[PDB]
Nucleic acid binder design. Structure first.
Lengths: 68, 66
DNA sequence: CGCTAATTCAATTAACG
DNA sequence: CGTTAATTGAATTAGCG
């Protein structure tokens, strides 16, 4: 099935991915405040940061052996 | 420490959201981007509003199925 | 084709008045 | 406490070297 017109796929920079990953290592579920400070520091929207964390947890769960 | 924050919509914001819901239950990105300007909300809050509004609507159909 | 960003859902949690 | 906005995993869609 084909979905309706969607937002253009965001291409992140080397800096952005490295910066987001540092926060992911501290916590997989950052509060709104943590995400907003990452959104300003990386010049991203709080929305793109929240979707990145949603997908980063999905990638981590797939590779993970343990229950958590 | 409040982990998440909450958006309290104005009556005008709700009129403009419900207007687009009655035209299209699944607005495209171009349609959502317009509401973001019209209602001063982010496109992100329009997605979230629309998915709760859809969930809310499907519950009605399940109750009035016979 | 692999990786991953974006968008749906059902179930559930938590902010606000 | 009631209302409902926000968040989550899971599934899925799809852009793009």
């Amino acid at each position: 099935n084909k979905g309706k017109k969607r937002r253009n796929r965001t291409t992140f920079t080397s800096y952005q991915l490295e910066e987001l990953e540092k926060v992911f290592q501290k916590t997989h579920y950052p509060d709104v405040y943590a995400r907003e400070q990452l959104a300003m520091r990386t010049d991203l929207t709080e929305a793109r940061v929240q979707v990145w964390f949603q997908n980063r947890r999905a990638k981590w769960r797939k590779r993970e052996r343990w229950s958590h």
